[PDB]
Amino acid sequence: PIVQNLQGQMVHQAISPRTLNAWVKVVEEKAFSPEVIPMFSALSEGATPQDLNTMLNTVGGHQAAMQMLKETINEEAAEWDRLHPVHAGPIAPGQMREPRGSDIAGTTSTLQEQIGWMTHNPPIPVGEIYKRWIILGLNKIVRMYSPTSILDIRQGPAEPFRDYVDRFYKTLRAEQASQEVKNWMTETLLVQNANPDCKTILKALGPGATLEEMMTACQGVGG
Amino acid sequence: PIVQNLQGQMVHQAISPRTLNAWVKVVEEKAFSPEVIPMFSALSEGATPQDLNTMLNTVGGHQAAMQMLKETINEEAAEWDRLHPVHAGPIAPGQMREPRGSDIAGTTSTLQEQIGWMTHNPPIPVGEIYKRWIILGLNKIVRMYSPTSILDIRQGPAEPFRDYVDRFYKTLRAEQASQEVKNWMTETLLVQNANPDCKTILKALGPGATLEEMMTACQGVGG
Amino acid sequence: PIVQNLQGQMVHQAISPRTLNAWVKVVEEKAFSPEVIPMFSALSEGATPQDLNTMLNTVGGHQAAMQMLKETINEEAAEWDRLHPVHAGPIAPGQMREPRGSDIAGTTSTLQEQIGWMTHNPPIPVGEIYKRWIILGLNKIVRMYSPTSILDIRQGPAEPFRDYVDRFYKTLRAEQASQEVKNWMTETLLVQNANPDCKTILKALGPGATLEEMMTACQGVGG
Amino acid sequence: PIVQNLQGQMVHQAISPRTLNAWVKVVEEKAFSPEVIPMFSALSEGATPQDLNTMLNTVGGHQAAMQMLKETINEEAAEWDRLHPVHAGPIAPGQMREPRGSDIAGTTSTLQEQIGWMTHNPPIPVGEIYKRWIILGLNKIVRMYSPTSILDIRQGPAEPFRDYVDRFYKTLRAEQASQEVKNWMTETLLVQNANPDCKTILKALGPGATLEEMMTACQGVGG
Amino acid sequence: PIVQNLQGQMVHQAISPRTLNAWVKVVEEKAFSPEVIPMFSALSEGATPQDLNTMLNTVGGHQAAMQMLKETINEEAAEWDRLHPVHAGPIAPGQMREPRGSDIAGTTSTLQEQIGWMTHNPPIPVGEIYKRWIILGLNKIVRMYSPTSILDIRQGPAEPFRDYVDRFYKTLRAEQASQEVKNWMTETLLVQNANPDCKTILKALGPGATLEEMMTACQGVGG
Amino acid sequence: PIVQNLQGQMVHQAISPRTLNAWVKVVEEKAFSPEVIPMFSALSEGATPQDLNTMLNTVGGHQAAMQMLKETINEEAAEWDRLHPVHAGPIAPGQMREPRGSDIAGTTSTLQEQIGWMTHNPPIPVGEIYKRWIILGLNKIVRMYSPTSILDIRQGPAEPFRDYVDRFYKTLRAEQASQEVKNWMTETLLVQNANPDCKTILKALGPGATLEEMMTACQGVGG
């Protein structure tokens, strides 16, 4: 994180041990369920690419996921190389360099350069750029670990509607495709994969029903 | 939260990991008992819509409640759209835009715009507005999870009056209707739902009795 | 709590989650034993009425005690209404309103008004006034939960005098009446409720003996 | 403790909940062993008499000891009343009152008066004065709870000399009388209460030997 | 770490006990697995050589690795002696000495000298140099404790490909040789060590397949 | 610890409860293994002798070690008395007294005199002098509690060389004599105390080998 010095040097505080302990505990305990993403987007606000690399390397568990994330980062860096080419020239008066793909990450970048690159006006936010690429690979990571496709979940013989809605929406959160298909999923197969008695009552309500209405309608009905 | 900078840039400190850990633990362990609401209204004082979204997304348990809460937030935002229409014009001299319904949430709003919207004079408190909508959906969430309606609780044959009063008032807190019906419920069903011996003693005291007198009257009386 | 701003705008700090967790844990584990009162008077130093309401509402256990405490607040607010009437007039030059009974609590009061009321010279100590009313109801609450009146305790056949003195003084703390009768209790039924051999030795020392002398007298004597 | 204000008002910081929890946990877990005293003299550095009263009241365990401590405090305050009489006159120009015995404690003293009394030049250190009287009663209290007089510690038949030295010096710490008799105890009964083989070897060394030599001599000798 | 004083003396903050506790716990629990390196590179940011020596000495577990690391530091200090020789002359006007190899560590160096050596312009960052030598020896330590060479890993008859990729990449992380040979390892022995059926699918996809494709290909295929 | 005041009074920050809890836990759990020394030298950076006395007195376990360390402090203070005698004269213009042996410790010294003695230029670092004497006695403390001399450790018939190196170097750390004999011990009895087959392979390597070669050579060789 960036902080101003008393005199003012635009200096960097080392990440707290508590944040790393919390992140490691979250990754270890929660496997790679979808809440890792908001948690990462919370523990790393304003963090430099060195801090993000520190949190990434601090993990010593599911190394396959970390390597796939590294491959995604490399692909996104390669993509970044093409979009903005090299300036092809000497240093402009009082001007620092332009971020390369590897420069965005902490591989080919000193801490002072990253300090400068996000504290100059106009700002090149290398931290948020690295965060976006990490999140985009964590998306795939969370997708791979869900052991159910959305078109496979149906509520059992003796099970409350509450548990079904929980499971269905957990799977829906895991299986990110797009907003339109998410709403289509919600409005069509929630009712069409239930218990025949639950099917009957849910059809009895009809279309255009909020989830609260569906939940209160099936409350107790089905036991 | 909003905190002034040393020079003064009106900058935002990232929410503490401890607060999110406490919030997640509370939601997990305590299910959705009525104590979630006062705790949420405490752990998120002055928080930006981004912080509220972070707390809302950090949980990975009861996804049905969070989806119903999201639907409630969408409804409240749609309601917000109608009440305040669009200015229909260019940017006024030295003036930022007006918060839309989605702008109140963090969906279509950058952190800097939210920072600006809540420190300009006069202030548009987007944080408090989003907090009210979140509380208005947590109310429904807490209502749904109480597994007993108020007119269904009756004190057992061998049970102290203390436990009955605890259960009755917990249910009364769960089932929010309005102040007057709460008072009428307290003054009419507490006595007319107890143990027959408890019925007799409460009849012996009579009406217009504070809860303290009711509790001390039956202390030991009924075992 | 009141905390000053760098520029100075008479601003308010939210209570740390640690204090709420500690208060909730104390109430949950310690029932309503007498040490709750000093604990409340310690964790809420300088706290605004909104903070006190947060601490009270965060509790989700013994709801009967919470409702009794709410009735006590209502009675003490009704009492407060009579003592200081309404000024019956318009706003005086540069003057804020006079706190009512409800305004003393957090029901009919905004945080900014509470800030203003407790930081202007001369100061209206709204927070301490609410604290006193809360403590006065916690007194009744603590009295109700002691499962022994003071004139029922007598030392067991084979039990050290230390345990007896512990129980007697715990009950003495619980049963608050008034100082002189407390002293009379101490100086009269410490001796005249004890074990027959203990009765004899305490008679042997005689009157006007400090608690240290009484404890050292029966050390080992009685086993 | 005392904390200076940004403008400078000589304001008071409330004790952290962590310190109260640590003090309560120490009193609970460690009984009333002699280590309570250094712990109290540590957790209460610079604390006002209100803070000391808070720490004393927060515990609801060994209530007999707390009454003993209160009686000792009252005696010490009564003693203080005699030594410093009443000024017998009106208020001197720009002068606050002279603390009484009760004013030294928190009974008859508001927090502001205590704040003033310890921040004026020359300083009346009411905090340290109250700390000394509390420590003086804690001395007696810790003496009472040691369940062995010093002249009863004789090392068992098959037990290492190290355990004997530990027990003997623990009792030596507990039984505080005066320095010279402490050294006499150390130099006379440590050797004259041990195992006859340990007695023999200790006699073999002779007098004027440091305790390190005492353990290194008997290391293993006696098994 | 480095902190500036209010007046400005460029003074040294002692490392919090929490950091030492976390580092000791990490070294104890995680043995000498590869996550120790990012852990040390994170918990010691900006630390003076005295802080690094404190972290090194605080642990009392695997003393063999600690002696190995000390020998590595001695070798790297001896190497440092040759590269930069002695200035061979008196003190230059307003100039401090040029660090020796042992001066880089905390053996022959006062804390104030290291303070001066790192706050002067141009900076001699003794902390970073000591950190690099510690890291280079921790690398050998982590290499020694991996109980499998890379060309010995083969996934069993009934085992998911996920566990194999985890184990293989953990081993690859442990066995650092160089980037090119790591890539070569990844590109041919991941597939040429699997289950014969898994061998069939991996052959079926063909070369030039990202790790994500390899994982999704054999998902469930092989049970 | 020393902390400058806002106005500037050079006032003393009270030691944290967390540090004392950590120190007490370390002493209790870790007995008196050599890791107590670096941990003590880390948890007490810049601490005044009052803080050191607080940490020492907070211990209530191995009281024999505490008394021996107290005698060591007394001896070191007596030694200190001889080296620097008394000035034998009145107070010099604007000069404070000279630290005596007891003055170095907290026995005959108020906190303010210690505050002055280490803040005035030139500085008399009383705290560091007390730290050195305490460390010198803790050295004997750790030496006494090691239940093995260095020339008594021999590795068993069936035990990995790693465990032997750990044990041997732990004992080596415990038994401090001098650097030369330490190196001689390392290079002469590490090999001459192993398992016959381990003896043969160690002979096969030969002299002039760093610990790394012995560790890798016997990896698995001996099972």
CSV table of C-alpha atoms in Angstrom, one decimal, chain E residues 12 14 50 110-112, chain F residues 1-2 40-52 73 76 80 99 103-105 114 117-119 123-136:
chain,number,residue,atom,x,y,z
E,12,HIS,CA,15.0,2.2,14.4
E,14,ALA,CA,12.0,-2.8,17.0
E,50,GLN,CA,20.0,-7.0,13.6
E,110,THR,CA,26.6,-1.5,15.8
E,111,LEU,CA,22.9,-0.8,15.3
E,112,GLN,CA,23.6,2.9,14.8
F,1,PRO,CA,10.8,2.1,25.6
F,2,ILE,CA,11.7,5.7,25.0
F,40,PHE,CA,14.7,-11.8,25.5
F,41,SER,CA,17.1,-9.7,23.5
F,42,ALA,CA,14.3,-8.9,21.0
F,43,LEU,CA,11.3,-8.4,23.3
F,44,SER,CA,13.2,-5.8,25.3
F,45,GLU,CA,14.7,-3.4,22.8
F,46,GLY,CA,15.3,0.0,24.3
F,47,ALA,CA,13.5,-1.0,27.5
F,48,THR,CA,14.2,0.8,30.7
F,49,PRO,CA,15.5,-1.2,33.7
F,50,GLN,CA,12.0,-0.9,35.2
F,51,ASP,CA,10.6,-2.8,32.2
F,52,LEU,CA,13.3,-5.4,32.5
F,73,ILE,CA,22.9,-9.4,38.8
F,76,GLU,CA,27.8,-7.9,38.3
F,80,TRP,CA,30.4,-2.4,38.6
F,99,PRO,CA,24.7,5.5,38.0
F,103,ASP,CA,21.2,2.5,40.3
F,104,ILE,CA,21.8,0.6,37.1
F,105,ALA,CA,19.0,-1.8,38.2
F,114,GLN,CA,16.5,6.4,34.5
F,117,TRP,CA,20.2,9.1,32.4
F,118,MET,CA,19.6,7.6,28.9
F,119,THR,CA,18.4,10.8,27.2
F,123,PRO,CA,24.2,9.1,26.9
F,124,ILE,CA,24.7,6.7,29.8
F,125,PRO,CA,22.9,3.6,28.4
F,126,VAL,CA,21.7,2.2,31.7
F,127,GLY,CA,19.2,-0.1,30.0
F,128,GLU,CA,21.8,-1.8,27.8
F,129,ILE,CA,24.1,-2.3,30.8
F,130,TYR,CA,21.4,-4.0,32.7
F,131,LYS,CA,20.5,-6.1,29.6
F,132,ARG,CA,24.1,-7.3,29.4
F,133,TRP,CA,24.2,-8.4,33.0
F,134,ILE,CA,20.8,-10.2,32.7
F,135,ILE,CA,22.0,-11.9,29.5
F,136,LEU,CA,25.3,-13.0,31.2
